[PDB]
């Protein structure tokens, strides 16, 4: 992830194939846990963009009210991810309908600079620029514990 | 209100912030095209005009200055623009 998302290969010394929605940078990538051919990335125009590789092109773009720092998929469900997002939130998206967030976990006080899923596809850790750590059980949507 | 980006604010954030403290300072007046009835004439007036603007042909009052937005007088038909 740089100026434009290059899909590399280990053997080929040059960018195997380039991808980009609009010529802004891209600040985070993550693949998924199943559908190993689907990619998601976020970029400095406050956008989440989903990509395919077996179709090899960007597929959808959403522009939020404030950037997302990092996103991750849930290794049980294959099409829901959470996006940890500088407006002091962890926004839980389903893929198909990106016109609404399945959840919004809401109890930090500064940006959220990374997030992840307990590989038991239930639990979320959110680490924030504010010197704490939340855990959320994905069905409620406030803070469940703070370290 | 609570938290909003410096760079890409909202439509609401823009049209709610002040007129000099928005991300790119800009105007808040506009222009009224109005027909004066005394001659059914078409004239342009500054939306915040500060004079008793009077049509050339019909020596009739169109708007009397009242603080900020120039206040019209009865029965003078306008559009914006």
């Amino acid at each position: 992830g740089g100026a434009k998302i290059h899909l590399w290969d280990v053997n080929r010394l040059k960018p195997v194939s380039d991808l980009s929605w609009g010529a802004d940078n891209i600040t985070s990538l993550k693949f998924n846990q199943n559908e190993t051919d689907i990619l998601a990335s976020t970029g400095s125009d406050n956008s989440i963009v989903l990509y395919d590789l077996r179709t090899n092109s960007p597929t959808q773009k959403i522009v939020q009210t404030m950037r997302t720092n990092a996103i991750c998929w849930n290794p049980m469900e294959a099409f829901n991810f959470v996006t940890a997002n500088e407006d002091h939130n962890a926004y839980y998206y389903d893929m198909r309908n990106l016109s609404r967030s399945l959840n919004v976990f809401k109890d930090h006080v500064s940006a959220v600079m990374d997030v992840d899923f307990s590989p038991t596809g239930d639990e979320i850790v959110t680490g924030s620029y504010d010197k704490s750590i939340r855990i959320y059980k994905t069905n409620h949507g406030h803070s469940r514990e703070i370290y | 209100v609570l938290v909003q980006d410096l760079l890409h604010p909202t439509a609401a954030s823009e049209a709610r912030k002040h007129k000099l403290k928005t991300l790119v300072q800009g105007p808040r007046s506009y222009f009224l095209d109005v027909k004066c009835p005394g001659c059914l004439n078409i004239t342009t007036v500054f939306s915040h005009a500060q004079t008793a603007v009077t049509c050339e042909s019909c020596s009739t009052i169109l708007c009397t200055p009242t603080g900020g937005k120039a206040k019209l007088s009865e029965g003078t038909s306008f559009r914006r623009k």
Binding site: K61, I62, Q64, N85, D87, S99, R100, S101, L102 | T10
Partner: peptide, 28 residues
């Protein structure tokens, strides 16, 4: 609450859709 007891056509922007500003591809 005040804006609503006075103003007429105010939508209830649901809080699972407050923070979205636009999709590109669309639906029905």
């Amino acid at each position: 609450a005040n804006e609503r007891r006075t103003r007429k056509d105010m939508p209830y922007i649901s809080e699972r859709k407050k923070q979205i500003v636009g999709t590109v591809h669309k639906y029905e």
